[PDB]
Amino acid sequence: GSSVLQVLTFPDDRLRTVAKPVEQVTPEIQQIVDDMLETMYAEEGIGLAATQVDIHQRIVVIDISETRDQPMVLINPEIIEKRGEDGIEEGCLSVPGARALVPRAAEVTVKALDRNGQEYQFDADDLLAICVQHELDHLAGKLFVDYLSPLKRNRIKEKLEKIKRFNE
Ligand SMILES: CCCCC[C@H](CC(=O)NO)C(=O)N[C@H](C(=O)N1CCC[C@H]1CO)C(C)C
Ligand code: NI
Numbered sequence: 001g002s003s004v005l006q007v008l009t010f011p012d013d014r015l016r017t018v019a020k021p022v023e024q025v026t027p028e029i030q031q032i033v034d035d036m037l038e039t040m041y042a043e044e045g046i047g048l049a050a051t052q053v054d055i056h057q058r059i060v061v062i063d064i065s066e067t068r069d070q071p072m073v074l075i076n077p078e079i080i081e082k083r084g085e086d087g088i089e090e091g092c093l094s095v096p097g098a099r100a101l102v103p104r105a106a107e108v109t110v111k112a113l114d115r116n117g118q119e120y121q122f123d124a125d126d127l128l129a130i131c132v133q134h135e136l137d138h139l140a141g142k143l144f145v146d147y148l149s150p151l152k153r154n155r156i157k158e159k160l161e162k163i164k165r166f167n168e
Pocket of ligand 1: 052091135
């Protein structure tokens with residue numbers, strides 16, 4: 001009942017769009033959620049933000065499980081508390097092939113709506129907390145390369161442009 005969507009890649013200006021809150025959790029929103037899950041699973045990857053598939057609403061899906069059967073849906077997520085410092089080497093479906101250390105909060109408390117519009121909240125640490133922060137950055141138009149030096153980011157940009165230089 002769902003489809004894999006095209007993932008935008010840096011330097012696509014649409015990745016800089018700031019997502020709007022979801023107004024109501026309609027069947028249309030649930031279809032977006034389902035398509036985002038399908039898209040996330042089509043690849044090695046543990047989360048996806050709607051911005052990355054050119055849908056500029058505050059929708060995130062996550063599955064950090066090894067078995068890929070523990071999905072989490074975050075509509076209108078808000079980080080309401082941050083604690084501590086952590087940082088791991090991150091990659092991004094919208095910056096394929098690039099990896100870098102990103103300083104993050106170690107722990108976050110997040111409030112969101114689930115796929116059915118039910119409000120909930122959770123405290124996250126370790127990989128879940130890092131993933132949440134990475135995905136919420138996407139909704140703000142922010143990519144992990146924005147934490148890097150201009151030189152490192154620009155070299156990544158040029159390499160990704162070369163890969164798509166014959167598209168369209
Ligand atoms: C780690 C912080 C959030 C990661 C989310 C991304 C997917 C993404 O771009 N979401 O916007 C991912 O799965 N990245 C993967 C990644 O960096 N992973 C997957 C598990 C943890 C770490 C180790 O490679 C790679 C395979 C692209
Ligand atoms: Ni990403």
